[PDB]
Design a protein around this ligand. Sequence first.
Ligand code: NA
Length: 130
Amino acid sequence: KVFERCQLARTLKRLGMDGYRGISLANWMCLAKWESGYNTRATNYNAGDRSTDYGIFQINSRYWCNDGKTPGAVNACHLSCSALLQDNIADAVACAKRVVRDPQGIRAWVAWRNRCQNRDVRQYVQGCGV
Ligand code: NA
């Protein structure tokens, strides 16, 4: 599924993402926008280390989900990476929350650092009723 902007903002708010571990909804929107263009079935294979990024948040298989084909990988979210390719984003949200419970927080995603950190992200939630 490719979410429209505001529908995703409300979906995320309903899932308890607004202010989760101090991360505003606008930051999560900026993250999903730059990681996948709000696309839940997005995938990116990293030929360099044999891992793959999954879903709307492009969560990596080396540490977060199990896809059975990533060397020496772990599964911190305790999910099959398949769960991160569903139209329903509940599991991807549970996993994204798990990611940010770690020291880096929202900084775990380099794209957030490149396109969201110290930027005016208000535009991502404007007019969505959130
Ligand atoms: Na894994």
